[PDB]
Coordinates of C-alpha atoms and ligand atoms in Angstrom, one line a residue:
X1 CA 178.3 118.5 98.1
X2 CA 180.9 116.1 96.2
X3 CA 183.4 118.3 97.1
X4 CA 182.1 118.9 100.6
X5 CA 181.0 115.9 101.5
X6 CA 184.5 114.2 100.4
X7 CA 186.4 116.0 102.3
X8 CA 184.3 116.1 105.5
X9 CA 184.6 112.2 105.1
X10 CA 188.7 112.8 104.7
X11 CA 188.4 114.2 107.6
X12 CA 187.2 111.9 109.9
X13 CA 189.2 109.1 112.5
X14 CA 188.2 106.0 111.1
X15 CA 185.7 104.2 108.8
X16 CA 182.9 104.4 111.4
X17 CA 183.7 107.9 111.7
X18 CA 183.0 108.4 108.3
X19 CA 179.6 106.3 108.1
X20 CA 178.1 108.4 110.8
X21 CA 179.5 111.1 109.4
X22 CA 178.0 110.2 106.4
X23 CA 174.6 109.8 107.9
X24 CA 175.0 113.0 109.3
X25 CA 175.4 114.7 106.3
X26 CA 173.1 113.3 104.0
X27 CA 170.1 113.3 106.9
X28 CA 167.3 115.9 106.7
X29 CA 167.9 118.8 108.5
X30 CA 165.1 120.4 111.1
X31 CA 164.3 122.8 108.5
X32 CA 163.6 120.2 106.1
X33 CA 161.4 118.2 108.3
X34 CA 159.0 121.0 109.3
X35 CA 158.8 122.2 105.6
X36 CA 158.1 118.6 104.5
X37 CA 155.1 118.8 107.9
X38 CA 154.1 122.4 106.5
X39 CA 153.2 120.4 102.9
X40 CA 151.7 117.1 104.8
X41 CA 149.7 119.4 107.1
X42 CA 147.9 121.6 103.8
X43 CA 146.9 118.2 102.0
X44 CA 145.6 117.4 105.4
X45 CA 143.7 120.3 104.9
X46 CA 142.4 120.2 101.7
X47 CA 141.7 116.7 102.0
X48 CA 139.7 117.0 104.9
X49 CA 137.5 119.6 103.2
X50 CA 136.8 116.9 100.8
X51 CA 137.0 113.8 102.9
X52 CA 136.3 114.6 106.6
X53 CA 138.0 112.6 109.0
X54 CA 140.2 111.5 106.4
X55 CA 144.2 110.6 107.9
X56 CA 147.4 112.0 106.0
X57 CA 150.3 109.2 106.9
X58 CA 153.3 110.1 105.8
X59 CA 155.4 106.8 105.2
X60 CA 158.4 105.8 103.4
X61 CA 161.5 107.6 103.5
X62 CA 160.3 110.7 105.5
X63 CA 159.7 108.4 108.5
X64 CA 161.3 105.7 108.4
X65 CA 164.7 107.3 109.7
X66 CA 166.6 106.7 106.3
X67 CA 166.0 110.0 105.0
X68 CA 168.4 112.1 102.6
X69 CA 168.0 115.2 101.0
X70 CA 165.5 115.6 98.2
X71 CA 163.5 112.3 98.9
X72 CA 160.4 111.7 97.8
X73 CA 157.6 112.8 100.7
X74 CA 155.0 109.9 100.5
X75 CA 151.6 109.8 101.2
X76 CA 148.7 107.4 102.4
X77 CA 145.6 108.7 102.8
X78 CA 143.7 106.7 105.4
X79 CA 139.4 107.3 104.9
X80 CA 129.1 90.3 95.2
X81 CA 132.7 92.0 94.9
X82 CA 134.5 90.7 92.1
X83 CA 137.4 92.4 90.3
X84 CA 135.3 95.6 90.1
X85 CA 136.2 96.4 93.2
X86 CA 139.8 97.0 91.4
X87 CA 138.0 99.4 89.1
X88 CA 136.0 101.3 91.8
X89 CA 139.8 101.7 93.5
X90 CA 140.6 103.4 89.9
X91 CA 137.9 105.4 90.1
X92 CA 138.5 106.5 93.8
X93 CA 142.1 107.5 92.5
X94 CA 141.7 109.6 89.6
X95 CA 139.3 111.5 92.3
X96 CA 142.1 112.0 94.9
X97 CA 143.9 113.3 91.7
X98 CA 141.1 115.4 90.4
X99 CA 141.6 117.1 94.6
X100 CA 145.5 117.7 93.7
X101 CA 145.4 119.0 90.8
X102 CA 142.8 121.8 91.3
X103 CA 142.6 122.4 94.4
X104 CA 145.3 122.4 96.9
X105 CA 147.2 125.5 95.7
X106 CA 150.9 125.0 94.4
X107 CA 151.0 121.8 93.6
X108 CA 151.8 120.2 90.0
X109 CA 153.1 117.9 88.0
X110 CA 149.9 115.5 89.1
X111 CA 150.0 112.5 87.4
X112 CA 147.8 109.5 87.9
X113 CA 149.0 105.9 88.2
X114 CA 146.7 103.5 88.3
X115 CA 148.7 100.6 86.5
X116 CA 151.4 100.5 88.8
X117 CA 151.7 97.6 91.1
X118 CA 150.1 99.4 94.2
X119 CA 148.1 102.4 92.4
X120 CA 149.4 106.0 93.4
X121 CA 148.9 109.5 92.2
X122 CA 152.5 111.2 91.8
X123 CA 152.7 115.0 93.0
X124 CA 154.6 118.2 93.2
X125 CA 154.2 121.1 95.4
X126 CA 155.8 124.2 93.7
X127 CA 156.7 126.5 96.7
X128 CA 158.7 124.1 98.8
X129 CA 159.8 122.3 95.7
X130 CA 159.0 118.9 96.9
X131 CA 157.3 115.8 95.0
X132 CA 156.2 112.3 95.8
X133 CA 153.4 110.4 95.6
X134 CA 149.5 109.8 97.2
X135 CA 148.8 106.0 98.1
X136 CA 144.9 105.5 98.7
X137 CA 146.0 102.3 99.5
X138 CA 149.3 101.1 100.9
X139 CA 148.5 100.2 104.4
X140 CA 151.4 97.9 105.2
X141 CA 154.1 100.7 103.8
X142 CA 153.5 102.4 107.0
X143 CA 154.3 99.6 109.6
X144 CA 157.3 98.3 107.8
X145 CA 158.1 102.0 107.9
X146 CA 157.8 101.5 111.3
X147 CA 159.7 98.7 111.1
X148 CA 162.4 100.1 110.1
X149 CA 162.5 103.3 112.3
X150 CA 162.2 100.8 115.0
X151 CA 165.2 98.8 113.5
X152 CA 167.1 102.1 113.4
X153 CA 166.6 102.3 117.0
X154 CA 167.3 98.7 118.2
X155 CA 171.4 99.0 117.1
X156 CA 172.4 102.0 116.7
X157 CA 175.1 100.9 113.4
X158 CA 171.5 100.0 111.8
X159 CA 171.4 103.5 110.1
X160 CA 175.4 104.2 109.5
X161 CA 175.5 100.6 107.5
X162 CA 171.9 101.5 105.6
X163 CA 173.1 104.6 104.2
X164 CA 176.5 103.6 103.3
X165 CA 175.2 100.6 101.8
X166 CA 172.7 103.1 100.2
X167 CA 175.8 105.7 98.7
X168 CA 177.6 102.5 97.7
X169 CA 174.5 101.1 96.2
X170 CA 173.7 104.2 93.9
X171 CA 177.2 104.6 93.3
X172 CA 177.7 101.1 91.8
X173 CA 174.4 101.8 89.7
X174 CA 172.4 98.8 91.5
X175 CA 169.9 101.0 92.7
X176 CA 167.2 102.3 90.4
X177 CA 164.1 102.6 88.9
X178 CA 164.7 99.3 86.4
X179 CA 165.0 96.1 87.2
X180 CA 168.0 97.8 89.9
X181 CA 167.5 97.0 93.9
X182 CA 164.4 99.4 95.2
X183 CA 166.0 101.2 98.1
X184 CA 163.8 99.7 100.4
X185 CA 165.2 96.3 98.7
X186 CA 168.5 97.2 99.6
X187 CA 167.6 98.1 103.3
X188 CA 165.5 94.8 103.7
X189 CA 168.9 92.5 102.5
X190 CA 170.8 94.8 104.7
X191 CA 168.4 94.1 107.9
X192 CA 168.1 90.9 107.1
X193 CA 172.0 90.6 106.6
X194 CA 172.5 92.4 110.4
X195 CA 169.8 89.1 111.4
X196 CA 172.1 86.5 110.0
X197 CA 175.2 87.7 111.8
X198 CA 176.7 84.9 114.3
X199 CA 175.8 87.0 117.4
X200 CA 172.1 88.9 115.6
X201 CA 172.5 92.3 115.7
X202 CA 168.9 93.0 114.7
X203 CA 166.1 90.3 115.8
X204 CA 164.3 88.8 113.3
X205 CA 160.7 89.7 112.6
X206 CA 158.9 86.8 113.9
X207 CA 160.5 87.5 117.4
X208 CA 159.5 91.0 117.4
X209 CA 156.3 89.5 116.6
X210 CA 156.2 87.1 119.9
X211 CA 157.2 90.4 121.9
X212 CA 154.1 92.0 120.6
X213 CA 152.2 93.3 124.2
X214 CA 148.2 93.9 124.9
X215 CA 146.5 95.5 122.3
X216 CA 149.6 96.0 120.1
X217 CA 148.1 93.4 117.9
X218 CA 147.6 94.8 114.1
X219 CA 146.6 93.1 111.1
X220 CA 146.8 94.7 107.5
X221 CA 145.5 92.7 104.5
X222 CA 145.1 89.6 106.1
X223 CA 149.2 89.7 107.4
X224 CA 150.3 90.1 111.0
X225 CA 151.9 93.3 111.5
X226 CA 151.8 93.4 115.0
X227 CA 155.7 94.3 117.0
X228 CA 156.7 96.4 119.5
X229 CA 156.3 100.7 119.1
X230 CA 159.5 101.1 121.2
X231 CA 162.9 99.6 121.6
X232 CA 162.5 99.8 125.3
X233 CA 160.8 96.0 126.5
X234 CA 163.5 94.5 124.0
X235 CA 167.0 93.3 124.9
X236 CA 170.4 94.7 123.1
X237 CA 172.5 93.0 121.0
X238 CA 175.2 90.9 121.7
X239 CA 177.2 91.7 118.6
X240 CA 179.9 93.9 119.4
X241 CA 181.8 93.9 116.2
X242 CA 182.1 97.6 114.7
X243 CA 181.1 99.6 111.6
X244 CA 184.0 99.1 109.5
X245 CA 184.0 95.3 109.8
X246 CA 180.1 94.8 109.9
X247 CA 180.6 96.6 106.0
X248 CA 183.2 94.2 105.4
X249 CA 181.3 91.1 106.2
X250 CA 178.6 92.7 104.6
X251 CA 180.3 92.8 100.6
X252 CA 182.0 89.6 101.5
X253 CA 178.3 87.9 102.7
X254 CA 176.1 88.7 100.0
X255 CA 179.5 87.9 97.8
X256 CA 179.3 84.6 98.6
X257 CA 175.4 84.1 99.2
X258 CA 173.3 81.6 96.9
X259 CA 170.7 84.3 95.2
X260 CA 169.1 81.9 92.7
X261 CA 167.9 79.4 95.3
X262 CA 167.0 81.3 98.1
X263 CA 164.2 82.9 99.3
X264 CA 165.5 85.3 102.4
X265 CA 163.5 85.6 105.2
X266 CA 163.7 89.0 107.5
X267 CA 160.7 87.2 109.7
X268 CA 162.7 84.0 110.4
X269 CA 166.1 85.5 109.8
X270 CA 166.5 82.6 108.0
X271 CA 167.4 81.2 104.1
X272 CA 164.7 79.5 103.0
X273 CA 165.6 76.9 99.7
X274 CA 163.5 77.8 96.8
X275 CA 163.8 74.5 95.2
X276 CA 161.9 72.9 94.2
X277 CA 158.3 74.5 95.2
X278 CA 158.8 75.2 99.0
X279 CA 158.3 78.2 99.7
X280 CA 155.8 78.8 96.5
X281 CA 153.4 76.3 98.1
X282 CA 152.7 78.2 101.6
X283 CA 152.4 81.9 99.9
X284 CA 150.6 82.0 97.1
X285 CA 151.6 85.5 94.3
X286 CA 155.2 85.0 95.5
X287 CA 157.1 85.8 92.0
X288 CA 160.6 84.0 92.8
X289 CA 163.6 84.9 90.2
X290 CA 167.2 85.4 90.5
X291 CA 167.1 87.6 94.0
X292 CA 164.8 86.6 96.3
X293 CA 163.8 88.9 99.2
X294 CA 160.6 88.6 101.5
X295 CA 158.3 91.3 103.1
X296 CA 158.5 90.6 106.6
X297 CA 155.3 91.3 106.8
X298 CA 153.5 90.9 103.7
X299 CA 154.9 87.2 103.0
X300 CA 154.1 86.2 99.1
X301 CA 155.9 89.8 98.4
X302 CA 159.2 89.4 96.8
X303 CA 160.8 93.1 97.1
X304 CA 163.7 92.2 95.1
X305 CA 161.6 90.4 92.3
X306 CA 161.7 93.2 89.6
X307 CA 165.3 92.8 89.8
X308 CA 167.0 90.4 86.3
X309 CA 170.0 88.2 86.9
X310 CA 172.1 90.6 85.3
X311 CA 171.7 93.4 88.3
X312 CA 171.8 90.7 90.7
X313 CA 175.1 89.2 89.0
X314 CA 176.8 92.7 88.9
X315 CA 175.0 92.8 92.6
X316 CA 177.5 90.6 93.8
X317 CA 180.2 91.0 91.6
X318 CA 180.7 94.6 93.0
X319 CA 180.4 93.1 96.3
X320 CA 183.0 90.7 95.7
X321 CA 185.3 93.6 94.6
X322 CA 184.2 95.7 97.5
X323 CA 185.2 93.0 100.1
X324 CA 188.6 92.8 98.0
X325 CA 189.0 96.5 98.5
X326 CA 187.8 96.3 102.0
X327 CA 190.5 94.0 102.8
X328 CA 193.6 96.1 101.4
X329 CA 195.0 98.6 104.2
X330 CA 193.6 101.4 101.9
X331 CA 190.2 101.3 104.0
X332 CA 191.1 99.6 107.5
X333 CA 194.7 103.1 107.9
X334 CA 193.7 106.3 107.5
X335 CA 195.4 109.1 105.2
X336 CA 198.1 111.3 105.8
X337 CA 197.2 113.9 104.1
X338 CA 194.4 114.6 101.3
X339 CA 194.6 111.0 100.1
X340 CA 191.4 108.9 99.7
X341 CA 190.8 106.3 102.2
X342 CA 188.2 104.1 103.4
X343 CA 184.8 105.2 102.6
X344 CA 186.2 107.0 99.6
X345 CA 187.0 104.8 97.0
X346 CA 183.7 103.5 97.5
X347 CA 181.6 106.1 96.9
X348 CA 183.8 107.2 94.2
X349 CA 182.3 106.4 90.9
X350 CA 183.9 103.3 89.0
X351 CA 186.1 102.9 86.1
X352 CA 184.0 102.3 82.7
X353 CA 186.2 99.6 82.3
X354 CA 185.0 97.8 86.2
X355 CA 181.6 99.4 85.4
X356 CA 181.4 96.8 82.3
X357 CA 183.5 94.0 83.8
X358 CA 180.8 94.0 87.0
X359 CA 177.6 93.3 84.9
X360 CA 178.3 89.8 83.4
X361 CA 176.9 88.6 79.7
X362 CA 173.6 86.5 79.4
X363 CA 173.9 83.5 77.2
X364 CA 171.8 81.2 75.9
X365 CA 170.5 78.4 78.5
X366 CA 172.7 75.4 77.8
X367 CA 174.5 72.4 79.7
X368 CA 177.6 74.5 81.7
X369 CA 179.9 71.6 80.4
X370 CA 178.9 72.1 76.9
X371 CA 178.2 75.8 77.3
X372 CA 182.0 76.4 79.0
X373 CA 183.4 74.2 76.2
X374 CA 181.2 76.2 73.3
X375 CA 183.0 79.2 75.0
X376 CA 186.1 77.9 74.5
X377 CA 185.7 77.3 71.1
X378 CA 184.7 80.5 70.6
X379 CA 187.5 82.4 71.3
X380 CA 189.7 79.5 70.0
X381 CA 188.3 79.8 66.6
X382 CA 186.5 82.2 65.6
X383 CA 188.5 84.7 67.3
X384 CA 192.2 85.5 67.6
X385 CA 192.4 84.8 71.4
X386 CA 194.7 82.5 72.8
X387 CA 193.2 81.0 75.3
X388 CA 194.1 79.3 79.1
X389 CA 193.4 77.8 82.4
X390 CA 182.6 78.3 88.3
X391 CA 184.6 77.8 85.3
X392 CA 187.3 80.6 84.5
X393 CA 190.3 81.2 81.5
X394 CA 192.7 83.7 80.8
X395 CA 192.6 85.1 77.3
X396 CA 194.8 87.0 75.7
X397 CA 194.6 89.2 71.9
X398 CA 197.3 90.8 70.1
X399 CA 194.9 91.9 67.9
X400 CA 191.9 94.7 66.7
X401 CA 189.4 91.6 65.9
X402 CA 186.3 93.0 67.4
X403 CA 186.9 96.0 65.4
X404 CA 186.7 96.6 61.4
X405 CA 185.0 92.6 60.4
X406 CA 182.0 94.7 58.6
X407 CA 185.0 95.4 55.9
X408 CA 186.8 91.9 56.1
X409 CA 183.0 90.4 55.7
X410 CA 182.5 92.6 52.4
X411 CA 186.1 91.6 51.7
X412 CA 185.1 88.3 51.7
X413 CA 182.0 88.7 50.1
X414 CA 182.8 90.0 46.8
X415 CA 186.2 87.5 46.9
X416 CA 183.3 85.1 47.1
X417 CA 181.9 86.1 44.0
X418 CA 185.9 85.9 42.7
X419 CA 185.6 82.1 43.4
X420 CA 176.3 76.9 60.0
X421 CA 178.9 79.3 61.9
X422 CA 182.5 79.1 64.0
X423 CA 185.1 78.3 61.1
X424 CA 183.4 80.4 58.7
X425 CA 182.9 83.2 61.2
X426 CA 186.8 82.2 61.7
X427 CA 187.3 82.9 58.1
X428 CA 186.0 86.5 59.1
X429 CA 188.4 87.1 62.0
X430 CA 192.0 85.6 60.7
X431 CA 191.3 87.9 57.4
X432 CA 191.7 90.8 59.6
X433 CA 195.0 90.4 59.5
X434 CA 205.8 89.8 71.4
X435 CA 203.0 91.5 74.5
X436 CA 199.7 90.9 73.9
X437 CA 197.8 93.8 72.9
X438 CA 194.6 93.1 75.5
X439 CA 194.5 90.1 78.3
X440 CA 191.6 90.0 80.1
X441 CA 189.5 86.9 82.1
X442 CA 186.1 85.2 81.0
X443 CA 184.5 83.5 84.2
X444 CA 180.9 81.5 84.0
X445 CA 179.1 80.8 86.7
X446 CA 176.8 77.8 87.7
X447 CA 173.6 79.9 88.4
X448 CA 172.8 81.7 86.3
X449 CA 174.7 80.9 82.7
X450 CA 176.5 84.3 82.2
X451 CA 180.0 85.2 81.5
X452 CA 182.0 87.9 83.3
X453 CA 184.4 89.6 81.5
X454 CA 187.4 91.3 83.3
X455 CA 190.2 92.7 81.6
X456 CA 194.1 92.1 83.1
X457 CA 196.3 94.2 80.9
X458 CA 195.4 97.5 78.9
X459 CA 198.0 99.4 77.9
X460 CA 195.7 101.1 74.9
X461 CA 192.5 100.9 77.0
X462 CA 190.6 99.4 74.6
X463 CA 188.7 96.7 77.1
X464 CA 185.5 98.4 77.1
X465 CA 185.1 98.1 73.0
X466 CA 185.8 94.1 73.4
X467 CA 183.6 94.1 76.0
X468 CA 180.6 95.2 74.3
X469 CA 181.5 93.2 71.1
X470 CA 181.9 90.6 73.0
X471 CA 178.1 91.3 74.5
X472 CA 176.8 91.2 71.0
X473 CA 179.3 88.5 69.2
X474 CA 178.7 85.7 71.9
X475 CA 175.2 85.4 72.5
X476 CA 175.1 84.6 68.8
X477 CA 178.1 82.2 68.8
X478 CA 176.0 79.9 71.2
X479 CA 173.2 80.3 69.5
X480 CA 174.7 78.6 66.2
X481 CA 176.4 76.6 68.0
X482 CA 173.3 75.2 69.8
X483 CA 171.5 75.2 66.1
X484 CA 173.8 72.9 64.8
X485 CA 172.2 70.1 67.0
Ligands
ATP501 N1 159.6 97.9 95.3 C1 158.8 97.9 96.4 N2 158.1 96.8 96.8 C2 157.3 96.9 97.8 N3 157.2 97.9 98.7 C3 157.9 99.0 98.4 C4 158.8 99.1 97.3 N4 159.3 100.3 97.3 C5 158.9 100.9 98.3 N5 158.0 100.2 99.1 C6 157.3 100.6 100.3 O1 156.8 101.9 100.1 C7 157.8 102.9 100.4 C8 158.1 103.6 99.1 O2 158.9 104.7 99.3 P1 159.7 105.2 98.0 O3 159.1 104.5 96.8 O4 159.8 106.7 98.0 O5 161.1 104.6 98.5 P2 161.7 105.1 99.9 O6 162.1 104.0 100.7 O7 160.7 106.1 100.4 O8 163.0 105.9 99.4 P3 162.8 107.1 98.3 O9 161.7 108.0 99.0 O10 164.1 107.8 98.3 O11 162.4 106.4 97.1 C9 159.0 102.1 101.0 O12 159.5 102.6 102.2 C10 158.3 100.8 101.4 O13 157.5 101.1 102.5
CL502 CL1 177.6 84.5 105.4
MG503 MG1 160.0 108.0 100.2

């Protein structure tokens, strides 16, 4: 498809072009859907011979419009109490799995997970080469699947930005299975950036809520999950800016967003400040951290709060250098002939060298003065760099110091036995040994304490072995430096 797909988005008028294009493309086909049916309909089957009147819901990806090819097919199956009742849910687990493994014909790789967050039992069926998972309970997953199949049909740019954002998302490596964005992450701080646009292009959750109608009232797990089933009693938006720009503001909005100290609400379209203790006192189990993104349903769920400050750093560091991009004439013009424009570069895999310079250093907590000035010290002394004017500096080496100190150190050592750390560590780095061999920026930010390193000159292309030198060396620098108070 690489090849395919790139050149079917070459092909196309413009950036919007290319995002519907793009959802085009990467959609389920009809085939697809009624194989994926074919599968949902024989574990209806077999799991009505053990549990009659038992539901199969198919949730998640499969219908909640955002489909691609080879996604998981997901599952619910609808049928003095202390924290037994956890136990019996165990129990009632490993049984659905006991059905899969043995009984429903074709199906493997069944594997029970009851110490996951919600408890599933994860599944393959063999013929159709599908897999995914059985939840006995995940009642909310379906209507915020709903929720965002109806999303998907209130603008219709909802599902072009989604899966762009998606392809971007996976292509910057901030979507995963670690502490990465979940995809349904990313598509909640994508909904809920379309509900903080000037004009809304999407209505916020607690509006949809006040839409509601007679009997549309639900409630799952004690949270109100009661909106609309169609698009049809609720007005159009007002917003009338395009594709290619509403991907734009996109980069350049969560670019410039406050993640540490904001929780972001899809149900009041609104940032709520984290601190102090707000939000934390009204939902209780809300787990607040360095990105902060609410259910709109279930309230004291953060979605985003797997994710470390170092994924939601490189978050928007990449989205600061996609709105850079975004503004060069490379995405707005199209190409001649055969060139990559607009959507391309994108999707295009990054240079090892951005890859690094996106995800940003943790240091030791410290005060950003003292930290910034420890820095500075740093590579000062203890390093070869000569340095220069969120804090930010331009450094520049003309040297190999990050490379070959193990030798200069057992240099020293046994010159030691001739006759607290920087000078001595300095010792180490002016024993290794007009353009500057490597120039490159180190920025800290307020929240969290991290530096970014980005190179500016590489002739030899050696930025990526500073950078993860760097990622061992100054961690440990601040530490000594903060031991020798
Ligand atoms: N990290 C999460 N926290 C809370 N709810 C989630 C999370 N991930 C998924 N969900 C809910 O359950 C569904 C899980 O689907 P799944 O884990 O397969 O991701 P998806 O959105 O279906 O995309 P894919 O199928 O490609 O992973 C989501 O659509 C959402 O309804
Ligand atoms: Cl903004
Ligand atoms: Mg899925």
């Amino acid at each position: 498809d690489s090849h395919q797909l790139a050149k079917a988005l070459a092909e196309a008028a413009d950036v919007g072009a290319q995002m519907i294009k793009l959802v085009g493309l990467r959609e389920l086909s009809e085939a697809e859907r009624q194989l994926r049916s074919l599968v949902v309909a024989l574990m209806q089957e077999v799991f009505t011979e053990f549990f009659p009147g038992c539901v199969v819901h198919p949730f998640g990806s499969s219908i909640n419009s955002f489909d691609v090819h080879g996604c998981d097919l997901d599952l619910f199956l609808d049928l003095e109490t202390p924290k037994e009742e956890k136990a019996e849910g165990a129990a009632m687990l490993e049984l659905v799995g006991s059905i899969l493994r043995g009984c429903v014909p074709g199906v493997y790789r069944v594997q029970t997970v009851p110490s996951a967050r919600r408890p599933v039992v994860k599944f393959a069926h063999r013929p159709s080469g599908l897999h995914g998972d059985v939840s006995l309970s995940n009642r909310l997953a379906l209507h915020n699947s709903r929720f965002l199949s109806l999303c998907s049909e209130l603008d219709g740019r909802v599902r072009p930005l989604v899966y762009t954002l998606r392809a971007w998302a996976q292509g910057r490596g901030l979507s995963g299975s670690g502490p990465l964005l979940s995809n349904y992450a990313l598509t909640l701080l994508v909904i809920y950036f379309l509900q903080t646009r000037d004009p809304p292009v999407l209505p916020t959750v607690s509006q949809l809520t006040q839409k509601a109608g007679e009997g549309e009232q639900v409630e799952v797990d004690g949270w109100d999950c009661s909106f609309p089933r169609d698009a049809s009693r609720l007005e159009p938006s007002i917003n009338v800016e395009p594709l290619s720009s509403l991907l734009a503001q996109f980069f350049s909005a969560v670019s410039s967003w406050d993640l540490r100290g904001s929780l972001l609400s899809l149900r009041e379209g609104q940032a709520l400040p984290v601190a102090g203790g707000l939000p934390s006192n009204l939902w209780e189990g809300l787990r607040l951290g360095p990105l902060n993104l609410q259910d709109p349903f279930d309230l004291s769920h953060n979605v985003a709060a797997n994710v470390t400050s170092r994924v939601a750093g490189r978050l928007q560091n990449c989205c600061r250098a996609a709105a850079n991009y975004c503004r060069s004439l490379q995405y707005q013009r199209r190409s001649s002939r055969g060139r990559d424009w607009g959507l391309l570069p994108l999707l295009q895999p990054s240079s090892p060298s951005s890859l690094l310079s996106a995800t940003p250093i943790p240091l030791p907590l410290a005060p950003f003065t003292q930290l910034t000035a420890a820095l500075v010290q740093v590579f000062r002394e203890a390093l070869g760099c000569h340095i220069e004017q969120s804090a930010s500096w331009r450094c520049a080496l003309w040297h190999r110091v990050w490379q070959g100190r193990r030798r200069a150190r057992r240099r020293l050592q046994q010159q030691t036995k001739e006759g607290g750390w920087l000078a001595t560590e300095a010792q180490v780095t002016q024993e290794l040994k007009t353009e500057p061999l490597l120039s490159f920026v180190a920025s800290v930010s307020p929240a969290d304490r991290m530096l970014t390193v980005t190179p500016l000159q590489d002739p030899q292309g050696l930025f990526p072995d500073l950078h993860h030198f760097l990622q061992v060396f100054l961690p440990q620098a601040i530490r000594h430096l903060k031991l020798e108070h």
